[PDB]
Amino acid sequence: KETAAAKFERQHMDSSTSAASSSNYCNQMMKSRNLTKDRCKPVNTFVHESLADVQAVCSQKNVACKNGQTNCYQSYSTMSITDCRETGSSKYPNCAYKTTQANKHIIVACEGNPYVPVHFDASV
Numbered sequence: 560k561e562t563a564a565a566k567f568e569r570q571h572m573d574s575s576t577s578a579a580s581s582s583n584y585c586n587q588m589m590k591s592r593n594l595t596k597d598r599c600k601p602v603n604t605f606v607h608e609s610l611a612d613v614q615a616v617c618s619q620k621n622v623a624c625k626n627g628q629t630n631c632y633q634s635y636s637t638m639s640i641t642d643c644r645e646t647g648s649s650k651y652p653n654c655a656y657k658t659t660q661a662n663k664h665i666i667v668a669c670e671g672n673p674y675v676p677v678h679f680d681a682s683v
């Protein structure tokens with residue numbers, strides 16, 4: 560019974576580094592955040608902004624979600640993010656990733672009271 564809010568924080572928040580710590584980052588973080596337990600999760604994004612600044616996106620630019628729901632929101636400012644991408648030679652349980660740093664607008668899906676991020680949809 561992890562809450563949806565807490566699952567988003569575990570899968571997508573890393574405020575403790577300004578940018579993709581190092582070439583090792585995604586290998587470490589995909590494992591430590593438990594995204595390689597049942598299979599290698601093929602792609603995942605981490606956001607290097609404060610929790611308050613990511614939560615605030617739920618009152619910013621309303622945009623269509625990829626799944627056609629209406630509860631997605633685009634950040635008005637660019638954010639520091641790390642994209643993690645499974646290498647073609649990565650074989651479970653030894654999940655290997657390329658670490659790439661970018662500064663992009665994020666899109667998140669928000670639900671509940673309080674209204675908070677529960678899903679990372681895209682960066683643009």
Ligand SMILES: [Rh+]
Pocket residue numbers: 677678679
């Ligand atoms: Rh999701």
Ligand SMILES: [Rh+]
Pocket residue numbers: 678
């Ligand atoms: Rh999900």
